[PDB]
Design a protein around this ligand. Structure first.
Ligand code: MG
Ligand code: ZN
Ligand code: ZN
Lengths: 1335, 99, 83, 50
DNA sequence: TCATATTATTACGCCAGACAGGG
DNA sequence: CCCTGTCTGGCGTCCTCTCACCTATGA
RNA sequence: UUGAUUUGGUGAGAGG
């Protein structure tokens, strides 16, 4: 029907072509009758007749002459909705410049006429004059004029002289502004200057000057001359219940503009003096500016009472504009809403739906069914039948329900599992019965929740509800590989009580010929549900190629494990039920069933799990009592020993032996130790309290205490909650953030007294305030993420590359945190992984790594896999099917089409609620040493010291994988060496961080080069020791006579000649920095490893500051080019740093703020990506210095650290694709033979297809540079202005798109959700393939 | 509460809100993102064009349902043409291009 | 009856084209003129379409072959009725 | 509210997350049957045409 | 009833982005 | 002229339910 | 050709 939406400026001829009549009078309506005004705002001739095909006043009351317009009516003759499309125009007496092009920041008329905003407004509000082609006088064109400047000029240049003001003058300036001429000038000005600031100031002005010439937008279209009025139907005038009309705000705005315009026409008729018509035109200017965007000028106008009234731009922008309130989200027919309840008899593809809601939602299907049978005739009869609800429409209703799915939806839908399609089962009742397992997907408890039902009307929508959105199809969460139909709380208690054991019961050690008579012995009353027993089970192992082989054997098991074996499908082994089956074990039971036997046995087995869990939890009778919370007998003596310890510490505090901070630290330490001891006392007293004999002496076992099974099963409860119900509830913290030294020694079974409950209320009010304010940032994070993603659709099958990121296991310094099988599960390898022995093709180079491949990776102990990542995908406008990976909720690769940006954005932002808002190296294991980034030297004693700061100390095992990693500073005492074998727990590293070592490479004698006591260094003989040290001063304390003196130590031989560095001809002089203290004095012979000086010195907003890419306040500074380094100017704002490369060109430098403790010396050579100071590091520096793969590893590690600290499983594909959407823009460095500009920022796919269709020719391409935009700056900088207008500020984006003449080749998800068509991702990707093919 | 078809608002062609007004459910923004997350392109297309806003689409759909033909004739939403007239009522010339 | 469409997804391996093929078929049965290739257990046209897909007798190629056969039948009908 | 005999146990899944399973003796005795009152106004204002 | 047309409170918290000031 | 406080604008969660209250003037 | 007004907007409170 139509391609792209084009936006441009509105010419006065274009506004007269939209229009149907000039709106003169401001008179709205008659108000005493019902008729409007002829001819006012709500006219007849200008727009249309209120009534359909009627002259409002009187003629044509049938259907013959539609169109005639008599003189007595001055009325058109069409439809009732004809006025909604027709718009009027107000002939503004005095020109008024647009507020969107005068105050957009930056203003469109501000950087175009080369005039400051302040000066532009002055003249615009009749407060300053502006010259326009004066003539032969001493005045510029842009230069303004004041009353005094004009008065004198008036008497001076009375002849050829022009100096107007207001929009009129502004219009002229714009009108008489040779665009083309300015281009060359600006272009020549940019090529004839070197000023950095000017360059950017000139490139931003020429960009908007050449863009205006590229389109059909004129400079004189900025000023509004023929103001357009919105259709009445769109500014509706309806009365509320009563006798008055509740009028809209736009009618106030238009009525004021028309009142003022009529006054201004009458004053220009009457020839009023100058100051009267200046105030009149100024009031018209402010009235127009208030109509368009109210409140952007000084304080907004108001009708009733002090609240400002809502203008047109406030009908567009905001949370309640048209995008976010009526075009992205709509209210919807065939929909319903009610309170949910359980109904556990359901199968997990069906839900209960009440009869009253079912007869209301399915009224047209029932009408069609009733008309088909022949029971009635006309539609009315059917509506009377279902209004009466006779006895025959319920069979009609059960025949329209049967195979027709519905979309259930819980009201805060965060990820895609919050809309699932069921089949209805009709309910006597008024509450939606919802299958319990599905509740863990919706985050739906049953404490008063409500859900909405939606009906797929058409046939393609019924098939999408059955084939994509059915609840049997969503059994794996799309964020990872974990099953989302995990059995939640009652059913794991029923299983944990069923499959367990006790050392004596009915039927101990009897033998049973099958699981059927195991259940028969449980039901008849001859054995117990947990009584250990040899049974004969027949497990089917499918060891052949798709053939199930039976093996039958006698397992020593219990009765309950055989009864649960009657429900397990064929292929799973018996050892999946042989254990005790908590919650992690039943989750991996369903996961192994899904990986082996597929989907249909896993659906039917999930239902049979839920049924048998509910049934035996009912048979269990697992209550909770007051006696179940067993108080430790050792608890009171532990509290008295802690009270004796705080008594000892305070008796030392009365005598002043210890400090106050050490007292507070000792009290918090002994109460933490006593808390851990009380928790261990109660945990022994709960986990093994049952001690029952069997045929003789006693024997112990794990307890059948009720609260212990609710904790050990993982149903509801943890260690901390069961700790607070029996042991002491810790040391609660006051809202100051610091802890309180007197704990809450009473649990909940004993009574809390008053003060302890008040401290508890501190600790809990902080948590409720944190959740109720955290949810806003979590939701706004999901919004920013799905609007930066929004476009990215799997659109190929292979990009045809060999690049991809290097997935290693991540190791922080403790034991190996996340194994390689968690990171390289289901992601397609980049090059073929060599087997760790020698040069073998273990896996090929384009294989998906599912579980079988990952097990053959874990057997061979594969180091790290080079795997394909989304950020390395070469596909223009989308992601190919291999560089994404596995489907994650489907076992296979991602299909051609499935929108991965939206599921990724939801999977990152959905755990936003669970996240929070507000010496030396000791080895642990026993293995082999390896060093990386190492340049070292052996000292005199033997400990290998390091001459490199950035050395990584890895502990490699005997197999080949890397198990530990650490960072060792410059100059540390390593107890070990390279390639060595150590023992578990042996200290291998040592240093002093408070004393920066200035250790050497060679030996010799020490001379004090440029070290003079009195100006350079100072004499501070030590007080308490006597062994003095010449203390080196810094460059700020010494005066300007000797500030140029750099103290240093250079090593010589026994004669005095300079001992050179081994490898060069340069001596090894070390320039001493500020605040140093000389350790080894003059004449002392040195060696390696000996110092030459003493140098003394996060949750959810972290996720936001990583995706939005803020800078930290003190970033780590780096080096943009390798080579030698040196210092510069002495403290003029900053302290300089000059880097001269060995082979490369010199002139790069950087002025470091000198408040940082540096890392580099003067004789040190640096590299790109090498640190100069320490602290956090901004991602833009990673991108422009190290590489794209470096910054994607930086973001995925720095945000999986937050998601792992709070314990959420998210696969890394989602963070890699939001990282792709961050660094999608690029900047040009060398324009080459293309049509770009020098420092123009252009999107990367554009410049790559440009120089890839030019490089296929003879011409060599253009060399770009990638840039990393934060997510809101990157979604507002898009080549599709509806995508950047449905999101944040619409004023800025619509003026930029309007003055650029931008066009929206739709080509994404939200443009097609706005404009009302098929999404180009899902089922509609075939439709968009067809439409893109047929052009 | 449930709604098949009844009265709507004035300015927009979408259904009213509430229970005291016999109105339908606001199919909000995150539900649209959840349908985009699946392949529900046709479910979303009737969810924002036929069931909600487009007047010719919904009258043709009601007659198509009661004839026994589950098929939608979509058209363009009315609130987007309301957007075009509110943007166009500024000094902005927003259009709809070639066939 | 119908709980999962997994075999139909196996025989048309895209999971997004299953909806389109079964929608084309269920419109051939609903308005439609045509009668199903499979016994119906009082299932609706959705489940009869997907149930035809699972036994491997409807895909995109069979529907285009049948529509070419109907176009040739209409061509022969027009030619043998007029001339 | 009113005081009722309550057992703490899982009963066949009908009290799964926070749900509550109630006998018929609670609904036979009218021991929660509350009474609601609705005011409804009707006015015959002279909007227009008499 | 039918045209006439706008004044005497303060008490968010970042976080970019543009601007006059000065070593 | 390159840092720099300082000022100005622009964000800040979805869905639902109940109730009340709506410009002054004026020969 | 067989019938009608809240959405508009504010404020306050509540549920998940
Ligand atoms: Mg709840
Ligand atoms: Zn007439
Ligand atoms: Zn690729």
């Amino acid at each position: 029907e139509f391609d792209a939406i084009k936006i441009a400026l509105a010419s006065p001829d274009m506004i007269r072509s939209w229009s149907f009549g000039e709106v003169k009078k401001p008179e709205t309506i008659n108000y005493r009758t019902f008729k409007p005004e002829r001819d006012g705002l709500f006219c007849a001739r200008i727009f249309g007749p209120v009534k359909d095909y009627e002259c409002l006043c009187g003629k044509y009351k049938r259907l013959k002459h539609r169109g005639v317009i008599c003189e007595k009516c001055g009325v058109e003759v069409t439809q009732t909705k004809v006025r909604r499309e027709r718009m009027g125009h107000i002939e503004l007496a005095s020109p008024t410049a647009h507020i969107w092009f005068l105050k957009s920041l930056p203003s469109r008329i501000g950087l175009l006429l080369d005039m400051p905003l302040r000066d532009i407004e002055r003249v615009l509000y009749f407060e300053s004059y502006v010259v326009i082609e004066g003539g032969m006088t001493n005045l510029e064109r842009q230069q303004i004029l004041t009353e005094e400047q004009y008065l004198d000029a008036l008497e001076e240049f009375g002849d050829e002289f022009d100096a107007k003001m207001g929009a009129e003058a502004i219009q002229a300036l714009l009108k008489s502004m040779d665009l083309e001429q300015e281009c060359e000038q600006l272009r020549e000005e940019l090529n004839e200057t070197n000023s950095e600031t000017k360059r950017k100031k000139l490139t931003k002005r020429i960009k908007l000057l050449e863009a205006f010439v590229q389109s059909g937008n004129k400079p004189e279209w900025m000023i509004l001359t023929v103001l357009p009025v919105l259709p009445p139907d769109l500014r509706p005038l309806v009365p509320l219940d009563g006798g008055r009309f509740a009028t809209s705000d736009l009618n106030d705005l238009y009525r004021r503009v028309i009142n003022r315009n009529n006054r201004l026409k009458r004053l220009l008729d009457l020839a009023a003096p100058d100051i009267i018509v200046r105030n009149e035109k100024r009031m018209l200017q402010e009235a127009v500016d208030a109509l368009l965007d109210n409140g952007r000028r000084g304080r907004a106008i108001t009708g009733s009472n002090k609240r400002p009234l809502k203008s047109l731009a406030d009908m567009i922008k905001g949370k309640q504009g048209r995008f976010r309130q009526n075009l992205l989200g709509k209210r919807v027919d065939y929909s319903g809403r009610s309170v949910i309840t359980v109904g556990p008899y359901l199968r997990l593809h069906q839900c209960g739906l009440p009869k009253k809601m079912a007869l209301e939602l399915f009224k047209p299907f029932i009408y069609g069914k009733l008309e088909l049978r022949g029971l009635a005739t006309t539609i009315k009869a059917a509506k009377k039948m279902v209004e009466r609800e006779e006895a025959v429409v319920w069979d009609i209703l059960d025949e329209v329900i049967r195979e027709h799915p519905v979309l259930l939806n819980r009201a805060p839908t965060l990820h895609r599992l919050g809309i699932q399609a069921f089949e209805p089962v009709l309910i006597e009742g008024k509450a939606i019965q919802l299958h319990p397992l599905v509740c863990a997907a919706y985050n739906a408890d049953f404490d008063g929740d409500q859900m909405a039902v939606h009906v797929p009307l058409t046939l393609e929508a019924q098939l999408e509800a059955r084939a994509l959105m059915m609840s049997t199809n969503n059994i794996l969460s799309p964020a990872n590989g974990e099953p989302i139909i995990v059995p939640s709380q009652d059913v794991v208690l029923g299983l944990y009580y069923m499959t367990r054991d006790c050392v004596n019961a009915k039927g101990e050690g009897m033998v049973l010929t099958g699981p059927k008579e195991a259940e028969r012995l449980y039901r008849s009353g001859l054995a117990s549900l947990h009584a250990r027993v040899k049974v004969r089970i027949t497990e089917y192992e499918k060891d052949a190629n798709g053939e199930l082989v039976a093996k039958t054997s006698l397992k020593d098991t219990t009765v309950g494990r055989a009864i649960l074996w009657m429900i397990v499908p064929k292929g799973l082994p018996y050892s999946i039920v042989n254990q005790a089956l908590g919650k992690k074990a039943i989750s991996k039971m369903l996961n192994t069933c899904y990986r082996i036997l597929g989907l249909k046995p896993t659906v039917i087995f999930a239902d049979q799990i839920m049924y048998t869990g509910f049934a035996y939890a009912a048979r269990s009778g697992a209550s909770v009592g007051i006696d179940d919370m067993v108080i430790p007998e050792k608890k009171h003596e532990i509290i008295s020993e802690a009270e004796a310890e705080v008594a000892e510490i305070q008796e030392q505090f009365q005598s002043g032996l210890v400090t106050a901070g050490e007292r507070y630290n000792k009290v918090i330490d002994i109460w933490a130790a006593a808390n851990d001891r009380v928790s261990k006392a109660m945990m022994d007293n709960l986990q093994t309290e049952t001690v029952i004999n069997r045929d003789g002496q006693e024997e112990k076992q794990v307890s059948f205490n009720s609260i212990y099974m609710m904790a050990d099963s993982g149903a509801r409860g943890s260690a901390a909650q069961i700790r607070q119900l029996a042991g002491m509830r810790g040391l609660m913290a006051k809202p100051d953030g610091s802890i309180i030294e007197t704990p809450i020694t009473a649990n909940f079974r004993e009574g809390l007294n008053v003060l302890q409950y008040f401290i508890s209320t501190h600790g809990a009010r902080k948590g409720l305030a944190d959740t109720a304010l955290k949810t806003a940032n979590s939701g706004y994070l999901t919004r920013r993420l799905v609007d930066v993603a929004q476009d990215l659709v799997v659109t190929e099958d292979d990009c045809g590359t060999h690049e991809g990121i290097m997935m290693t296991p991540v190791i922080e310094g403790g034991d190996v945190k996340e194994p390689l099988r968690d990171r390289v599960l289901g992601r397609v390898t980049a090059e073929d992984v060599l087997k760790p022995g020698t040069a073998d093709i273990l896996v090929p180079r384009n294989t998906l790594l599912h579980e079988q491949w990952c097990d053959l990776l874990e057997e061979n102990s594969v180091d790290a896999v080079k795997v394909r990542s989304v950020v390395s995908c070469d596909t223009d406008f989308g992601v190919c099917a291999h560089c994404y990976g596995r489907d994650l909720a489907r076992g296979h690769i991602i299909n051609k089409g499935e929108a991965i940006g939206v599921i990724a954005a939801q999977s990152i932002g959905e755990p936003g609620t669970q996240l929070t808002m507000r010496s030396s190296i000791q080895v642990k294991n026993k293995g082999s040493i390896k060093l990386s980034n190492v340049k070292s030297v052996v000292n005199s004693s033997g400990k290998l010291v390091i001459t490199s700061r950035n050395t990584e100390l890895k502990l490699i095992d005997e197999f080949g994988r890397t198990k530990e990693s650490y960072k060792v500073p410059y100059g540390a005492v390593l107890a070990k060496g390279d390639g060595e074998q150590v023992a578990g727990g042996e200290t291998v590293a040592n240093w002093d961080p408070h004393t920066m070592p200035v250790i050497t490479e060679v030996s010799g004698f020490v001379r004090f080069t440029d070290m003079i006591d009195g100006q350079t260094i100072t004499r501070q003989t030590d007080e308490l020791t006597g062994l003095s040290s010449l203390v080196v001063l810094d460059s700020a304390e010494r005066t300007a006579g000797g500030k140029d003196l750099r103290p240093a130590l250079k090593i010589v031989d026994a004669q005095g000649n300079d001992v050179l560095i081994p490898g060069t001809d340069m001596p090894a002089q070390y320039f001493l920095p500020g605040k140093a203290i000389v350790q080894l004095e003059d004449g002392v012979q040195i060696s390696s490893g000996d110092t030459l000086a003493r140098i003394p010195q996060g949750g959810l907003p972290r996720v936001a500051d990583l995706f939005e890419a803020r800078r930290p306040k003190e970033p780590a500074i780096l080096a943009e080019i390798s080579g030698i380094v040196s210092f510069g100017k002495e403290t003029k704002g900053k302290r300089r740093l000059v880097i001269t490369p060995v082979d490369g060109s010199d002139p790069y430098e950087e002025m470091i703020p000198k408040w940082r403790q540096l890392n580099v010396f003067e004789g040190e050579r640096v590299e790109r990506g090498d640190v100069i100071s320490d602290g956090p590091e901004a991602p833009h520096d990673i991108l422009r210095l190290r590489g794209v793969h470096a910054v994607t590893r930086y973001i995925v590690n720095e945000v999986q650290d937050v998601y792992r600290l709070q314990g959420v499983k998210i696969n890394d594909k989602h963070i890699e694709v939001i990282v792709r959407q961050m660094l999608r823009k690029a900047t040009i460095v060398n324009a080459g033979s293309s049509d770009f500009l020098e420092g123009e920022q252009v999107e990367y796919s554009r410049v790559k297809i440009a120089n890839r269709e030019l490089e296929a020719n003879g011409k060599v391409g253009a060399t770009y540079s990638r840039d990393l935009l934060g997510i809101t700056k990157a979604s507002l900088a898009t080549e599709s202005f509806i995508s950047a207008a449905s999101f944040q500020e619409t004023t800025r984006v619509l003026t930029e798109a309007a003055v650029a003449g931008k066009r929206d080749e739709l080509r994404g998800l939200k443009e097609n959700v706005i404009v009302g068509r098929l999404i180009p991702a899902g089922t509609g990707y075939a439709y968009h393939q067809d439409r893109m093919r047929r052009r | 509460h449930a709604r098949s078809t009844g009265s709507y608002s004035l300015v927009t062609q979408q259904p009213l809100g509430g229970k005291a007004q016999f109105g339908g459910q606001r199919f909000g923004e995150m539900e649209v993102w959840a349908l985009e997350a699946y392949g529900a392109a046709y479910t979303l297309q009737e969810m924002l064009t036929v069931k909600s806003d487009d007047v010719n689409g919904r009258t043709k759909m009601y007659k198509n349902i009661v004839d026994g033909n589950h098929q939608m004739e979509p058209g363009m939403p009315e609130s987007f043409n309301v957007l075009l007239k509110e943007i166009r009522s500024l000094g902005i010339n927003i259009e709809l291009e070639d066939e | 009856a119908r709980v999962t469409v997994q075999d139909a997804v196996e025989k048309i391996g895209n999971r997004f084209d299953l909806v389109l093929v079964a929608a084309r078929r269920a419109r051939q049965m609903q308005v439609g003129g045509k009668d199903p290739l499979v016994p119906e257990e009082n299932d609706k046209t959705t489940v009869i379409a997907l149930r035809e897909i699972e036994e491997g007798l409807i895909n995109n190629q069979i529907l285009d072959v049948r529509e070419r056969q109907e176009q040739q039948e209409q061509e022969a009908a027009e030619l043998q009725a007029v001339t | 509210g009113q005081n009722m005999r309550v057992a703490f146990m899982p009963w066949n899944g009908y009290n799964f997350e926070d749900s509550i399973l109630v006998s018929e003796r609670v609904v036979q005795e009218d021991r929660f049957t509350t009474i609601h009152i609705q005011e409804l106004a009707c006015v015959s204002r002279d909007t227009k045409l008499g």
